[PDB]
Write a protein that binds this ligand. Sequence first.
Ligand SMILES: C[N+](C)(C)[C@@H](Cc1c[nH]c(=S)[nH]1)C(=O)O
Length: 275
Amino acid sequence: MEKENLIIAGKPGPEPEILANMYKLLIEENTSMTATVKPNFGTTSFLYEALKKGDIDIYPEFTGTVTESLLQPSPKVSHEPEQVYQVARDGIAKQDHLAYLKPMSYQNTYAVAVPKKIAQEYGLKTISDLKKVEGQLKAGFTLEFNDREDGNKGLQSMYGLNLNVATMQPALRYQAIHSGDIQITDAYSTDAELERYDLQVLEDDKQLFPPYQGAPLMKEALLKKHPELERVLNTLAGKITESQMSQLNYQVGVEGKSAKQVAKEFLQEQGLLKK
Ligand SMILES: C[N+](C)(C)[C@@H](Cc1c[nH]c(=S)[nH]1)C(=O)O
């Protein structure tokens, strides 16, 4: 008699769309609620604010992003993913009363990336190596990465790097680095574009980037209304490897397949969804 509909959003990209449709498929099979997925609905701070204000109900957030962008002041965390999740989970509950569920296994980190030929021609192995050639190479970064302390501001503070940066739209940066307009971009480690374009990830030798694992973020009030959401979505906890997410991103972003159908097929193959 109550078929409440949940709004599930995801940041720009095939990956959050896949994850949101996974949440929707799981919720509709195992609960009495429905869900609407809002693709590419906004960047981190928009979804975070929409969640607190109640314009959306759930979105997938990443552990290092909670501690680095969402928590103010940002706590000094280790590199161990489980401890970082605990700080994020406990921290985001105290600050904003948000229930951060348990993470999936794969990490999706910011990844400073250059074409393989650029790495070989310039002797680039680590992020530190970029200081050698910061006057010769052009970088194209998302605005959010430019805005973040664990992004370009961290490249400046932690490495002393002063890159020549053009601010880029997220969906256009890979084509620019492939075409030669830029030689450095802020890749995401599960992005299918890394292998497609023969990009090489530079090693985070100073460990600017914390761990990033994804998990559902929602108001505590929604969990109180619907406690079954915790068990239902936590079937993803500790699941989905890096290579599994990458192939799903490839299926949606590159092969043009429906995010819902890709999500559904993977869930069924893995035994989390009927049929
Ligand atoms: C996965 N990630 C690399 C840690 C980022 C990706 C991202 C940040 N902003 C947008 S849009 N996407 C994030 O979710 O914070």
